[PDB]
Amino acid sequence: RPTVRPRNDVAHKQLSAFGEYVAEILPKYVQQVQVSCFNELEICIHPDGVIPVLTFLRDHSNAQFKSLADLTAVDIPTRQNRFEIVYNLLSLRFNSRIRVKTYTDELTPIESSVPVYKAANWYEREIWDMFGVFFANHPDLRRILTDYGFEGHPFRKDFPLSGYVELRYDDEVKRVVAEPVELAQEFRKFDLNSPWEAFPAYRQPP
Template sequence: MTDRAAPPFAVDPTALRQAVADTLGPLAKRVDLVLDEITVTVTAADYMKAALTLRDAPECRFDQLIDLCGVDYSEYRNGAWDGPRYAVVVHLLSLELNQRVRLRVFAPDDELPVVDSLMDVWPAVNWFEREAFDLYGIVFEGHLDLRRILTDYGFIGHPFRKDFPVSGEVEMRYDAERQRVIYQPVTIEPREITPRIIREDNYGNLH
């Protein structure tokens, strides 16, 4: 039995990192290679231009957006993080060159995180940006239909933020007398969620 051959056009990660760094030049704040994965970090001001370069440059040709998500760094490294709180992370794929890259941008304002929308670069980003807006409150400037996609239209807050309460803030129910859906403060009573094996010294007679 012979070893499976490497896929065609597979690129050495070190060589790809250098090619991406050379192509982006000053548009990239840093280009990291960790575990054979490349992460490009750019400023919000250079985000759109860097995205267009990664899509169109001959050495890159990242024609497909695989994923976009938000990140809340407020508790990163047990609170030791001192950079901007919110980031947007994009995963890109070049079908032609069989290579991948991760693009990361930090929103400069923690109170109102705003970055450019990439809908004009990769239209498939539409629902991904709506999800990041819904869950993290990140605003994508230039998005033509930026509204919630997972939570209800009347939902208050952004549930993937680290400071969002575990039980939420409001709940929705159908009121039979009013014959409509109403919102009210959460009525879930606090409960113990620590596993018994941790909170009870002799649980299961384990010694």
């Protein structure tokens, strides 16, 4: 069918089998395993398992996920652990990718993964900067993307889009000064969601 993305059953079955493989080997930390309809394997783990689970996936002979493609966070305010930490790993030996997911909150520290991947250094600094997640035993945790002395973590869902302060050069003090933000035109919020359900396959029971 020309307009529909074809399924790949061979990859789906293979990724499911490796999902069981990892879960059986690390039952102490794996809380859930799932494979999406477009064939991406996710391993959801207890946060204590960051270093053990990532080390196993990097070094084990049947895994060999040598590359850390990306490491990011997702803020979900409804969850009591609002932050979800996502590791996307790449295996060149087996030409495969895997996603590892954990969670934390505003106060619980996550163990730094810099020992497992040197790539995690700046990624974890970005997560601290944008989300306020503290990484323990990081060799140099500090802001990376925001202005020096910037208050707040802009990527949290409750941080306002335009922030709290804005800059301008003030001729009286001869320097760039910060002041509370005032907008000549407020950002116009749009309510775009249609009141009719689109995808029955994802309906949540009442």
